[PDB]
């Protein structure tokens, strides 16, 4: 059966805050199609010939 | 469950039947008939 990823139950008190000291620049990627090709069917040719 | 005086309790799971769902979530599913 799935996990659904890792438990992280994190610490919320009531008066602490996590504040980052360090950063890591990432660079993801991400694909879009935007275009198909260009057919074009001519019934008469192919129904026919 | 102390978060400055704001009542999560309606969006929270109950623990406190099976599922695990919230109040809303069962209302959500008992509101919906298949």
């Known amino acids: 059966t799935m996990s659904l990823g890792a438990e992280n139950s994190v610490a919320y008190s009531n008066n602490s805050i996590a504040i980052p000291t360090n950063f890591t620049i990432s660079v993801t990627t991400e694909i879009l199609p935007v275009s198909m090709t260009k057919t074009s069917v001519d019934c008469t040719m192919y129904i026919c010939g | ?34």
């Open chain 2, 1 to 34: 469950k102390d978060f400055g005086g704001f009542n999560f309790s309606q969006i929270l799971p109950d623990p406190s039947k099976p599922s695990k769902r919230s109040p809303i979530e069962d209302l959500l599913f008992n509101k919906v008939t298949l």
